[PDB]
PDB file of C-alpha atoms in Angstrom:
ATOM      1  CA  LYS A   1       0.000   0.000   0.000  1.00 14.78           C
ATOM      2  CA  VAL A   2       1.171   3.537  -0.681  1.00 16.23           C
ATOM      3  CA  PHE A   3      -0.146   5.794   2.038  1.00 16.55           C
ATOM      4  CA  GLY A   4      -1.140   9.381   1.555  1.00 15.99           C
ATOM      5  CA  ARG A   5       0.858  11.850   3.652  1.00 16.06           C
ATOM      6  CA  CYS A   6      -1.989  13.067   5.899  1.00 15.88           C
ATOM      7  CA  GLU A   7      -3.550   9.567   6.003  1.00 13.96           C
ATOM      8  CA  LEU A   8      -0.281   8.322   7.486  1.00 17.33           C
ATOM      9  CA  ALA A   9       0.037  11.245   9.888  1.00 16.94           C
ATOM     10  CA  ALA A  10      -3.444  10.519  11.246  1.00 17.14           C
ATOM     11  CA  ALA A  11      -2.616   6.862  11.835  1.00 16.40           C
ATOM     12  CA  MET A  12       0.661   7.750  13.536  1.00 18.80           C
ATOM     13  CA  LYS A  13      -1.114  10.222  15.790  1.00 19.33           C
ATOM     14  CA  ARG A  14      -3.752   7.621  16.761  1.00 16.92           C
ATOM     15  CA  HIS A  15      -0.827   5.506  18.009  1.00 16.02           C
ATOM     16  CA  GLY A  16       0.741   8.308  20.058  1.00 15.37           C
ATOM     17  CA  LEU A  17       3.794   9.173  18.000  1.00 11.56           C
ATOM     18  CA  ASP A  18       3.184  12.936  18.125  1.00 13.65           C
ATOM     19  CA  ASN A  19       5.999  14.209  20.405  1.00 13.58           C
ATOM     20  CA  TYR A  20       6.989  10.695  21.497  1.00 14.01           C
ATOM     21  CA  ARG A  21      10.482  10.807  23.054  1.00 11.47           C
ATOM     22  CA  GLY A  22      10.862  14.375  21.906  1.00  9.27           C
ATOM     23  CA  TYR A  23       9.985  13.881  18.237  1.00  7.89           C
ATOM     24  CA  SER A  24       7.105  15.929  16.858  1.00  9.24           C
ATOM     25  CA  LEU A  25       4.777  14.228  14.381  1.00  6.73           C
ATOM     26  CA  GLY A  26       6.389  15.771  11.340  1.00  2.90           C
ATOM     27  CA  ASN A  27       9.632  13.924  12.110  1.00  2.39           C
ATOM     28  CA  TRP A  28       7.858  10.570  11.759  1.00  3.59           C
ATOM     29  CA  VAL A  29       6.078  11.506   8.551  1.00  4.52           C
ATOM     30  CA  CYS A  30       9.302  12.877   7.094  1.00  4.68           C
ATOM     31  CA  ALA A  31      11.103   9.653   8.059  1.00  3.60           C
ATOM     32  CA  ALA A  32       8.526   7.557   6.216  1.00  2.84           C
ATOM     33  CA  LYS A  33       8.610   9.813   3.168  1.00  3.98           C
ATOM     34  CA  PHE A  34      12.363   9.460   2.683  1.00  2.00           C
ATOM     35  CA  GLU A  35      12.740   5.866   3.920  1.00  2.00           C
ATOM     36  CA  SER A  36      10.032   4.332   1.689  1.00  2.00           C
ATOM     37  CA  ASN A  37       8.050   7.034  -0.144  1.00  2.00           C
ATOM     38  CA  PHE A  38       5.129   5.881   2.021  1.00  3.93           C
ATOM     39  CA  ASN A  39       5.253   2.318   0.645  1.00  5.53           C
ATOM     40  CA  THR A  40       4.372  -0.424   3.120  1.00  3.19           C
ATOM     41  CA  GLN A  41       6.109  -3.084   0.996  1.00  5.30           C
ATOM     42  CA  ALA A  42       9.467  -1.356   0.574  1.00  2.00           C
ATOM     43  CA  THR A  43      12.403  -3.696   1.204  1.00  3.80           C
ATOM     44  CA  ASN A  44      16.151  -2.963   1.075  1.00  2.00           C
ATOM     45  CA  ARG A  45      18.728  -5.717   1.468  1.00  2.00           C
ATOM     46  CA  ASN A  46      22.051  -4.757   2.955  1.00  2.00           C
ATOM     47  CA  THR A  47      25.598  -6.083   2.662  1.00  2.00           C
ATOM     48  CA  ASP A  48      25.755  -7.313   6.251  1.00  2.00           C
ATOM     49  CA  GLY A  49      23.030  -9.862   5.755  1.00  2.00           C
ATOM     50  CA  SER A  50      20.264  -7.703   7.208  1.00  2.00           C
ATOM     51  CA  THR A  51      17.211  -6.308   5.455  1.00  2.00           C
ATOM     52  CA  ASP A  52      15.223  -3.125   6.028  1.00  2.00           C
ATOM     53  CA  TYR A  53      11.490  -3.665   6.021  1.00  2.00           C
ATOM     54  CA  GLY A  54       8.387  -1.644   5.402  1.00  2.00           C
ATOM     55  CA  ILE A  55       7.226   1.918   5.577  1.00  2.00           C
ATOM     56  CA  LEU A  56       9.830   2.843   8.216  1.00  2.00           C
ATOM     57  CA  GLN A  57      12.588   0.583   6.853  1.00  2.00           C
ATOM     58  CA  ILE A  58      13.163  -1.191  10.186  1.00  2.00           C
ATOM     59  CA  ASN A  59      16.333  -3.300  10.176  1.00  2.00           C
ATOM     60  CA  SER A  60      16.305  -7.024  10.799  1.00  2.00           C
ATOM     61  CA  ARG A  61      19.522  -7.333  12.790  1.00  2.00           C
ATOM     62  CA  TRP A  62      18.138  -5.989  16.074  1.00  2.00           C
ATOM     63  CA  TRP A  63      14.403  -5.525  15.620  1.00  2.00           C
ATOM     64  CA  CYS A  64      12.518  -8.347  13.822  1.00  2.00           C
ATOM     65  CA  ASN A  65      13.027 -11.971  12.865  1.00  2.00           C
ATOM     66  CA  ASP A  66      13.396 -12.925   9.184  1.00  2.00           C
ATOM     67  CA  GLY A  67      15.139 -16.250   9.808  1.00  2.00           C
ATOM     68  CA  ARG A  68      18.313 -15.298   7.923  1.00  2.00           C
ATOM     69  CA  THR A  69      20.035 -12.310   9.556  1.00  2.00           C
ATOM     70  CA  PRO A  70      23.250 -12.767  11.585  1.00  2.00           C
ATOM     71  CA  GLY A  71      23.353 -11.382  15.095  1.00  3.33           C
ATOM     72  CA  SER A  72      19.618 -11.529  15.410  1.00  2.00           C
ATOM     73  CA  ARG A  73      18.130 -10.034  18.578  1.00  3.06           C
ATOM     74  CA  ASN A  74      14.477  -9.597  17.513  1.00  2.00           C
ATOM     75  CA  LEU A  75      13.921  -6.934  20.151  1.00  2.00           C
ATOM     76  CA  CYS A  76      10.425  -6.103  18.890  1.00  2.22           C
ATOM     77  CA  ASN A  77       9.519  -9.773  19.211  1.00  3.86           C
ATOM     78  CA  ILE A  78       7.873  -9.978  15.792  1.00  3.43           C
ATOM     79  CA  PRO A  79       8.354 -11.621  12.444  1.00  3.41           C
ATOM     80  CA  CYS A  80       9.667  -9.134   9.895  1.00  4.89           C
ATOM     81  CA  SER A  81       6.622 -10.047   7.755  1.00  2.00           C
ATOM     82  CA  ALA A  82       4.527  -7.999  10.222  1.00  2.00           C
ATOM     83  CA  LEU A  83       6.439  -4.884   9.149  1.00  2.00           C
ATOM     84  CA  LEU A  84       5.211  -5.333   5.551  1.00  2.00           C
ATOM     85  CA  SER A  85       1.536  -5.172   6.470  1.00  2.00           C
ATOM     86  CA  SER A  86      -0.794  -2.690   4.831  1.00  2.00           C
ATOM     87  CA  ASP A  87      -1.800  -1.268   8.220  1.00  2.00           C
ATOM     88  CA  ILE A  88       0.998   0.335  10.203  1.00  2.00           C
ATOM     89  CA  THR A  89       0.304  -1.276  13.618  1.00  2.00           C
ATOM     90  CA  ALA A  90       3.414  -3.445  13.930  1.00  2.00           C
ATOM     91  CA  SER A  91       5.742  -0.798  12.481  1.00  2.00           C
ATOM     92  CA  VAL A  92       4.610   1.935  14.881  1.00  2.00           C
ATOM     93  CA  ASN A  93       4.689  -0.369  17.922  1.00  2.00           C
ATOM     94  CA  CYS A  94       8.231  -1.456  17.052  1.00  2.00           C
ATOM     95  CA  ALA A  95       9.298   2.136  16.276  1.00  2.00           C
ATOM     96  CA  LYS A  96       8.411   3.142  19.827  1.00  2.00           C
ATOM     97  CA  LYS A  97      10.855   0.521  21.076  1.00  2.47           C
ATOM     98  CA  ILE A  98      13.609   1.551  18.641  1.00  5.91           C
ATOM     99  CA  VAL A  99      13.396   5.246  19.442  1.00  6.73           C
ATOM    100  CA  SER A 100      13.559   4.555  23.174  1.00  8.46           C
ATOM    101  CA  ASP A 101      17.032   3.008  22.688  1.00  9.19           C
ATOM    102  CA  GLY A 102      20.361   4.730  22.413  1.00 13.08           C
ATOM    103  CA  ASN A 103      20.268   7.192  19.608  1.00 11.46           C
ATOM    104  CA  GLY A 104      16.569   8.023  19.162  1.00 10.62           C
ATOM    105  CA  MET A 105      15.605   8.708  15.544  1.00 12.41           C
ATOM    106  CA  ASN A 106      19.221   8.606  14.436  1.00 14.11           C
ATOM    107  CA  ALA A 107      18.485   4.884  13.869  1.00 15.80           C
ATOM    108  CA  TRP A 108      16.750   5.908  10.620  1.00 16.71           C
ATOM    109  CA  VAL A 109      19.257   6.627   7.876  1.00 17.37           C
ATOM    110  CA  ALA A 110      16.817   8.689   5.859  1.00 19.49           C
ATOM    111  CA  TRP A 111      15.703  10.749   8.823  1.00 16.49           C
ATOM    112  CA  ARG A 112      19.338  11.624   9.567  1.00 18.36           C
ATOM    113  CA  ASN A 113      20.063  12.404   5.884  1.00 18.27           C
ATOM    114  CA  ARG A 114      16.914  14.338   4.865  1.00 18.44           C
ATOM    115  CA  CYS A 115      14.857  15.329   7.947  1.00 16.80           C
ATOM    116  CA  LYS A 116      17.081  16.188  10.907  1.00 17.66           C
ATOM    117  CA  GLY A 117      17.231  19.933  11.503  1.00 15.86           C
ATOM    118  CA  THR A 118      14.744  20.810   8.798  1.00 18.77           C
ATOM    119  CA  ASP A 119      11.269  22.309   9.014  1.00 21.15           C
ATOM    120  CA  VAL A 120       9.661  18.961   9.780  1.00 20.18           C
ATOM    121  CA  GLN A 121       6.283  20.516  10.485  1.00 23.77           C
ATOM    122  CA  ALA A 122       6.097  20.999   6.709  1.00 22.62           C
ATOM    123  CA  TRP A 123       5.275  17.277   6.445  1.00 19.19           C
ATOM    124  CA  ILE A 124       1.932  17.720   8.144  1.00 20.06           C
ATOM    125  CA  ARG A 125       1.064  20.887   6.170  1.00 19.78           C
ATOM    126  CA  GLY A 126      -2.619  21.011   5.236  1.00 19.92           C
ATOM    127  CA  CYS A 127      -3.552  17.992   7.413  1.00 22.12           C
ATOM    128  CA  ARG A 128      -6.468  18.371   9.878  1.00 22.58           C
ATOM    129  CA  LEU A 129      -5.333  16.205  12.747  1.00 23.78           C
TER     130      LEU A 129
END
């Protein structure tokens, strides 16, 4: 599924991401825009044997089980298949766990490369939330 921008923001807000751990809603929408272009089925395979899954491109080394990644910790306690669902439930629940670790939203490559320090409230422009 390819989400619309405000459609996604609304779902993320329902699940309490607005301001979670110090990250306003626009950070999360921006992250999804540049990680996956809002595509729930996006997949990126990396050189270290891990794969990034879904709308938030969550990595399989620490966060989900795909049965084939070295150093697997599966700290969200979910199959990586859950992160490719058309609803965002598993991705947002796991994201809360990721962002509560160590480096916050710096875990997301695209957020660090395209969102950090920008006018992130632009990503919820014209949404009625």
